[PDB]
Amino acid sequence: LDTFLNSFPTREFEDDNEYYWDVIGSSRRNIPLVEARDENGVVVAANAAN
Amino acid sequence: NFPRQMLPFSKKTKQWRKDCLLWANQKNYSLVRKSVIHKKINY
Incomplete structure (x- = not known):
């Protein structure tokens, strides 16, 4: 145990x-989506068109 | 750590010298000097 604790240096x-x-951490990231709307304002659901 | 200096010259190999330098750039206290921030405020 003395030899294992002598294998590390010492900072004052x-x-x-x-x-x-x-x-x-890094500056690059990706952001999750919350919702999505079309031009008129209604939210794009899962069973919606293009 | 800073390696053993009490060696023969043949065991002062290239990796022994490289571990003395690698100890130096891991990163000060002196008994007759001021701290570095004490001196830098004076400059």
Whole structure:
């Protein structure tokens, strides 16, 4: 157990408070659809035309 | 970690030297210097 915990390096810290690190996601995404309407305003259902 | 420096010269191989450099760019405290943010506010 001493050899396993000696295989990791050591970072000093300035204070005795909590410490963070920022994790990042990407800027590219896709957006789900909610509804869809035609020109006159009625919602496009599943059994509708083109 | 930073590897063993007490080796013969033949065991100071290419991968031994590369693990000293790889330790350095994993990422400071000095007993006679200020912190880096203390100096940069002075500049």
